[PDB]
Symmetry: C3
Subunit: 114 residues, 3 copies
Amino acid sequence: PMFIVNTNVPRASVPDGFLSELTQQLAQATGKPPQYIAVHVVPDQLMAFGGSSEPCALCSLHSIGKIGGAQNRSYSKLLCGLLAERLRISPDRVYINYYDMNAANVGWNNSTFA
Amino acid sequence: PMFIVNTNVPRASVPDGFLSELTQQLAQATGKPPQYIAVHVVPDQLMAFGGSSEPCALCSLHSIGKIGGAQNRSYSKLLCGLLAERLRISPDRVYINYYDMNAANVGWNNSTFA
Amino acid sequence: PMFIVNTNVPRASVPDGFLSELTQQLAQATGKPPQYIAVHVVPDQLMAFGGSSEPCALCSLHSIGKIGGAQNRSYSKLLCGLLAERLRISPDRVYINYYDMNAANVGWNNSTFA
Ligand SMILES: *C(=S)NCCCC[S@@](C)=O
Ligand SMILES: *C(=S)NCCCC[S@@](C)=O
Ligand SMILES: [Cl-]
Ligand SMILES: [Cl-]
Ligand SMILES: [Cl-]
Ligand SMILES: [Cl-]
Ligand SMILES: [Cl-]
Ligand SMILES: [Cl-]
Ligand SMILES: [Cl-]
Ligand code: NA
Ligand code: NA
Ligand code: NA
Ligand code: NA
């Protein structure tokens, strides 16, 4: 699983341990070992949501399987909750693109998971 | 709709109103209210296009529907025009990846659009 | 072809001419002329892989065709090799998402490749 968050919120407002919490909570959410979870946080971005420059975020969650209608709603409640509580970003100013990746299309360790 | 632009042009060369201009133009192009549109511009990037470092841009346009052969050809003209005038990027040094997203794979406000 | 690398390694550790090496190596691996190849390297990122902040990378390779089981394994060996040699990133701390793009979904110079 790979979770990426792009936001206009300043780096200083990202709480210590945020990447660790994301790793831990995504491991529990996806059911995959935390060892394989990758997290990427990109603050101080130049972005807008609805024409407003107030706090917002554009994210991505890639995973080989464990992606679906019900699961994605669950991931959204989890992730929007964290962005709201930890980064003070309103849930309605966050978009998360979910990708169900084929094992053959994910490279790792000089090979792929296929 | 979500539009992201990654470019090597300096932050100082990105007009302060560019995000709003993109939002408004994309609202008209997609026929969606500006409120639903998110924009993200990433300047000062380390990039090369065709083995050259002159101004260039790698972009992404995500949308739940409103994506297709004909529509994409139209978006390219709209976006290349904006990047050409406001960021000084030659249109033949711009790539735009279009993504037609399923509502179930787009998270927002603690849920998804499905 | 479009190759993007997001890594936590410092900018200073990115060798001069690294972009050129990626361009030429990708031209060889994909068979496409270098004039159409785009490369993007993003260092100094706030990332974690397996919860650890040791050197790691999240990448993407977009291409109209030339994507597949065997081909992707080959690309991974090539790209992980370059990241290990040039950026000192362990191959088991690198993920590469491969995307086989439909020509109609890749915009360039006021149109698409369809
Ligand atoms: C997230 S995309 N992890 C990469 C794929 C892991 C394969 S099995 C160990 O889930
Ligand atoms: C762009 S990806 N907007 C996402 C969906 C916006 C709401 S629907 C009701 O158009
Ligand atoms: Cl599901
Ligand atoms: Cl895939
Ligand atoms: Cl269409
Ligand atoms: Cl989708
Ligand atoms: Cl952890
Ligand atoms: Cl193949
Ligand atoms: Cl596609
Ligand atoms: Na998919
Ligand atoms: Na799609
Ligand atoms: Na940056
Ligand atoms: Na594809």
